[PDB]
């Protein structure tokens, strides 16, 4: 597909072992998971991983970061509106849980996902139903959680913002990501598991020299696998066929 | 092997076309062939064709350039020395007359091949046989002759240097190179021919952009097909992986 | 995905450097692009690249050969109709104006597009919007134009059917487009960039001989590189695997 | 290198499936072995295998053809002469038991292998030693023994020609060889295996069409595999990418 | 794309190679063809060939098995619903025979296909029109019809359940499939190609050693080719890279 | 060939960064050098590059282990002997000294190498030529010198057995190799770096397990490099095609 997102938990690192550690753990199980971590540190992956090696893989995964959604339509997205009840509701669309009935959803940080929200989401973890938007019905859902939140719930709960029953439910299974740069044993491995996403991606394929490679073992990754990520696409489809470095790349990551 | 010569009869151009024309006339034949036309411009690849599509592919196949020879020994590496015959043979060698019983045998710059060489050299192919270095025998030997060289025999001939009944003999089928600056359509073309040979010398492959490209269907090639066999050459180990061009070509191509 | 076109700027010969020159010139601009010279001869992908290689490339691309359309529905097809306000009109669908916004859109043989529709072209891009079918709004549109006949507009002009104030928005960059048989130089690059397309096209591959290679750079191509794919493509399922050639192509390059 | 054999016990019919089961039986020993069956039945390879698998892979192996030597010479290939005790030896050469001290060594057609000569083989596998041409000395020789006879031995006994002392030492592990003619569910099977081999001899590859396959499994194979590999070799540098068959091949096979 | 089923008539076989003979007879005709064998011997496939090969292929093509849907939809999934002539239709929905007008459509288990739509079925290839759900008019339509029943009809029309003038008309061209155990010499062959599908499908290949190959050659195939497709493809997301074999296919065709 | 050493120079660790920024120093330079570790920590490769990298790539390169070769014959080994001048001197052989002339020449564990013929050694960086056996004669020698032991010279001088003007001109250079279990970062980049050696040595290629390689990063590699090597050449012949892993490996490294 177009997704930017790969074969991520390569890795020799103890670090990324133990994350694998935490995988192995949780993987039989239908309840709830909880992914704690900076963001853009692949949380997705060891989601979609969970979902395949799971009992339901032949179902289907929905994402949804409840970022990048508005505020107002949140609702709707999620529980899904029958044309009408919903002022300029003109489709009879289906919700993620509609969606979602057989596989597991993914939700991006919950600590964004509003408080008015947050309450019907506890509903539906215990009332194994929800409501469309503008019905009186309620319907049967069959549906594993997963969610992964960059900040601290801890906190986001003394500060009232989110509720202390949510969480009892959600910390079944934790398990907290490691960043990238706590990871550099990793870096060149992955670096091979990107040109072969990208060499099938666009025409051609690159290669770094390494000049750039111990370059790129020398950053910060702020941004993570997912900043990474970013990164690789770009040269794949900016130089094509081409070495790569040795000062290439942005300006930024000229280290010594 | 470790040669740095190819398939190279690849092209569109009416020019090269022609001299694939020239080939098809004398390919049955066991008679003699003349490859006229200036070095560097792949007599050798003409004549190795020569012989695998004639009746004798079977056989072998001595490439000899009498210029990279000095001079004295030129009659043993032809005709051979029996241990002790000539002032310190100390090996019971065989000539490439010897050698080339069988398949054929191909001369370079025969205009180089000095008077004395010669006159022997016409013997043999009338002769039907030849003798080693110090010996009274004649020896049975079935040969097909092809040679090359870069001068115009007419004009050796009236200095002297070249006897008019070599001529005779040589010139059952004349084939006339083309030089690489008026193949330009063919440039292209070889390059891949090229790297498809070199991709499996070294380790990795290169590839041309189209800006060094042009710049190289721009040039002279004075040493032609050979020149440029040596270029490709360099550069395949020099960067490897690499784009090559836009500039990364000697500082001489440089061309607008 | 299924198109039939491809990589086409491959070439050695002069014509189509030329008309990479050409390329270059206007690659910088939001503003309009004319491309003349016969059918076929790749108009498409010379405007495809100008997309990609513009400021706009991460935006949409629409073509629309004024041609197939028949005459009376071209201007819902271009502006989009309300349910309703065309008599027939079942769908609230889209203009290609409306689906072109942010990238760029594509017109062909404009010289065939008629009297009344290039007027209301004239207005929107001067008037910076259009009007649906059968609505009294005008809607913001940045979409930058690009446009391809095949016919003189010069003659276009005196003979009427072509507004003379469309042509001088249109020519503030002209591209000549060269036909195949003026790039005979070019034959042999792309008849390999095509088995590299179709090789993925189909169970197979095929390969020219030489024989049929030249007799391919003999023919006309009235109908130039569009006549050529059409080809290629048609062996290429035709006889998978094979040589191709000698005289396994129609019996109409048939030629000496 | 140049041999022309293959992976060759590829099969499934039952034909093959039990010389593979002989195979089986006789891996683990030191001891003896017989092959027998027509020649050109992929005896050599049954053989080269044997070794391989056995405890001395990191040993060397041996082939000679009885066959192909003249009868005089058989005796100082096999043992070796030490220069001048035999009228003409100008070489201190070994033989092939020197050779093959550590590995195995394999003789073919040994009812061709004459009778003063085989008198010599029997000393040699009871002796544990043999005397180089001219020498009064006996060399410590470890070699495993392997032989195959196109022809039948009960009847060379009874004729006299083969002594039944070397028969009853060889016989410890019977292997018998299905001709191919026999084995035609295994046809295809191995013309895949021969493709993969010759791709990689020459330019190009080849493929069969259905056509022809069915044509090749229609005949007799007096030469069998042996007669097969000659036929693919022949046709993989006769029409070199192309299809094969469907009467591309030689007019014998023209099957109905 | 998903399917799961391949070029499947690969084999040595008299078995296939007379159902290959079948498929020649009847390939140039629009008349209709009756595919009898078991289920799951690759009936579609041999249809979907008759559609490419035939005259039609740039046409469509639509595959019904009668069994899946169950018994009340049966007629406006063929035929096809205007929104409210049958209690419930939303939708103004095609048939399959709107669909496959142009192309061929595909019929399973017709023994299966209820008494009532049968004799609907008889009409539209006599009455060359068909009435949608709810309407008094007839449509035009050009299609060519397979179809593939695992069931004896012969006995299907003593027993009453089948129109002696349905089969009447479909057995113009009759072809009758042969048991994949009945094939077994073409087992190995399409296990290539089963790899060679999968390869392709999922991260990695598998390869299957001779151990469990034979064994695969020893198997029922109750559920013939299409069990066979079933099976390699689990193990090819089971386990990948590996082997295969020797065990390590289900307890079942644990086979000496 | 047939070496069993490769690319390994791989590598993110700051333990391996550092071994190439030593060899960074030494690159241009034509004098000695002096390579320090354990044995099997790749040392030859770290030398082979020195040579290819200096301005002498065009030359030879011997390798000569003072280890393996006897005591007695390491003179002539080295320097060469005239027949006869030894007793039992047949031919005329060259050291390898006369070898290297032109390139460089590699000698290892020098702490092996006998106090006898490390003084003649002295000479000849100093004489600038040498002698060979039985001969009253220099010989003029233009060759590079890199050498390798894995034992401490600092204390084979105080010892005695190794004399301090060696030392002293060997030491312009010294570089200090890192064992393997200090270099863990490292172990899957090479061992990639290995099948893609293997997998053009035997038929097949293998694939290591996360299992496996997490056990293998576990290991001492007392044998470091080397040893490693040693491994995934055994299990490419073993099992191939295989996977590897889990605990197909030896009994030794089953690392929990
Ligand atoms: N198009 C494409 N996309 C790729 C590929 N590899 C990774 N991705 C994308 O990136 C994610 C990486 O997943 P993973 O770590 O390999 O983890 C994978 C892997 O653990 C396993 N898996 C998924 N598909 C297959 C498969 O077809 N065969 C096998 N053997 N395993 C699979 O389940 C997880 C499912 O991942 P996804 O949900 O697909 O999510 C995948 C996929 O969505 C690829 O080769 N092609
Ligand atoms: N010379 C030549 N080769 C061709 C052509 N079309 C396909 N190929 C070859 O086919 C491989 C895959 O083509 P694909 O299936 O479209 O798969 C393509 C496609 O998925 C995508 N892609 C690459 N270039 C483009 C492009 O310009 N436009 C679009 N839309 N997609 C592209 O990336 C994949 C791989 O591209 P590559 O890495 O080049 O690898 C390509 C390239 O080897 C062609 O017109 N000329
Ligand atoms: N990563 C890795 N890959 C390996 C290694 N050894 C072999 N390969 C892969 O195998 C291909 C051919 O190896 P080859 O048979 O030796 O054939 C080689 C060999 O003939 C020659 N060659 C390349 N590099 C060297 C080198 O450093 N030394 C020598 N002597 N020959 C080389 O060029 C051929 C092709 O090299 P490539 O173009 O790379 O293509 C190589 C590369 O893909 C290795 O140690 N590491
Ligand atoms: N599926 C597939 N289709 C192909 C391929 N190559 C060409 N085509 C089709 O034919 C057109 C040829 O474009 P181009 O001359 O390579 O010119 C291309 C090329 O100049 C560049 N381009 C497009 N895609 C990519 C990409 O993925 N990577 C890179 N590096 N350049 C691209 O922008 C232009 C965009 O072309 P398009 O609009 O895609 O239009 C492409 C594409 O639509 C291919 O490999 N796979
Ligand atoms: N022996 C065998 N090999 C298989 C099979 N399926 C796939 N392959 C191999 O996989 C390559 C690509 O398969 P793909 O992804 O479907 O990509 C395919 C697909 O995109 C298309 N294609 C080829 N044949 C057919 C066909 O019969 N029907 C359809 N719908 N598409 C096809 O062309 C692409 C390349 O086909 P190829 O050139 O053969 O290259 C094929 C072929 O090497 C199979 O059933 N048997
Ligand atoms: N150059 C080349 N020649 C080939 C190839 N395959 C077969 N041949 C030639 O044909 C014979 C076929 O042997 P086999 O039946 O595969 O039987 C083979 C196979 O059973 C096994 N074997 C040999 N070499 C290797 C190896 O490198 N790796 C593995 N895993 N097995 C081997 O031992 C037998 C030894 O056979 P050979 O004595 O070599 O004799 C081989 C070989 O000499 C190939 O891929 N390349
Ligand atoms: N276009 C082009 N491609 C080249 C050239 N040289 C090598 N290749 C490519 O490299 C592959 C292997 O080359 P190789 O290592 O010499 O391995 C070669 C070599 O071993 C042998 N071979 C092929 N053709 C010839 C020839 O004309 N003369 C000789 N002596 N050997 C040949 O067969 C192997 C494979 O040949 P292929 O099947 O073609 O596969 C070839 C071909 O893909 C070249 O000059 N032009
Ligand atoms: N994606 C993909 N799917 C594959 C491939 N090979 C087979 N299949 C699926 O499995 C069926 C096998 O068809 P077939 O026996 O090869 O029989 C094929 C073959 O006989 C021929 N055919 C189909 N497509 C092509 C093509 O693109 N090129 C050529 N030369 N022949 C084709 O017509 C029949 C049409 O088959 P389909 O209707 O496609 O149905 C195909 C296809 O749907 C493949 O390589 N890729
Ligand atoms: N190391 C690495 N290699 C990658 C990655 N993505 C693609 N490749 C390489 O690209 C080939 C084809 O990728 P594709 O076009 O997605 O085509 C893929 C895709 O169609 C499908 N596939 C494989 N794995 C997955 C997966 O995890 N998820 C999904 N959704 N699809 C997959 O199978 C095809 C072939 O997969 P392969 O057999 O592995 O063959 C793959 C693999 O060689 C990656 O993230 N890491
Ligand atoms: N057959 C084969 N053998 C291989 C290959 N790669 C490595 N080896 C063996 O293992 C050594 C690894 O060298 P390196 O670290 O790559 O270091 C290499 C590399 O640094 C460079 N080099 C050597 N050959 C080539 C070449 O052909 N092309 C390029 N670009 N560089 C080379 O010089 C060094 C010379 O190494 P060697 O003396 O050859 O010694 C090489 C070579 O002898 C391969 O691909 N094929
Ligand atoms: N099915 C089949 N395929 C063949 C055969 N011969 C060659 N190939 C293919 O050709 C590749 C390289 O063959 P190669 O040039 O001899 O290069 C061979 C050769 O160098 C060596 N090798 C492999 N097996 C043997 C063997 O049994 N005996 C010997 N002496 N060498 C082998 O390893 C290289 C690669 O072997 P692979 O990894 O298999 O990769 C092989 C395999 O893909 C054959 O008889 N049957």
């Known amino acids: 597909r177009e997704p930017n997102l790969f074969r991520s938990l390569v890795g020799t690192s103890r670090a990324i072992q133990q994350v694998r550690q935490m995988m192995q753990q ?3 199980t239908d309840a709830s998971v909880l992914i704690l971590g900076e963001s853009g540190t692949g949380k997705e992956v060891v989601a979609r991983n969970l979902h395949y090696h799971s009992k339901r893989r032949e179902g289907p995964f929905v994402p949804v970061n409840c970022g990048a959604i508005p505020a ?46 947050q309450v019907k989401l506890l509903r539906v973890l215990q009332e194994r139903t929800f409501e469309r938007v503008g019905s009186n ?8 959680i997963i969610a992964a939140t960059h900040k601290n719930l801890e906190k986001m709960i003394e500060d009232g913002t989110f509720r202390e029953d949510l969480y009892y439910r959600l910390n079944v299974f934790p398990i907290e990501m ?9 870096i060149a491995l992955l670096l091979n598991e990107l040109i072969s996403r990208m060499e099938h ?14 370059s790129l073992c020398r950053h910060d990754w702020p941004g993570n696998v997912r900043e990474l990520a970013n990164l690789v696409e770009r040269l794949a489809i900016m130089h094509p066929y081409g070495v790569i470095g040795v000062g290439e790349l942005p300006k930024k990551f000229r280290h010594v």
Not at 88 to 109: H, K, M, P, V
Not at 178 to 185: D, F, K, M
């Open 178 to 186: 490691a960043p990238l740069r706590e990871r550099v044993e990793d």
């Open 72 to 117: 107002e339509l949140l609702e709707s997205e999620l529980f899904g509106h029958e044309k009408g009840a919903f002022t300029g509701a003109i489709t009879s669309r289906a919700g993620r849980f509609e969606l979602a009935n057989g596989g597991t959803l993914f939700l991006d940080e919950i600590g964004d996902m509003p408080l008015p929200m």
């Open 201 to 214: 991606e666009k025409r051609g394929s690159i290669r770094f020299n390494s000049a750039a490679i111990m």
């Open 137 to 144: 019905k309620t319907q049967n859902v069959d549906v594993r």
């Open 26 to 28: 949780v993987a039989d």
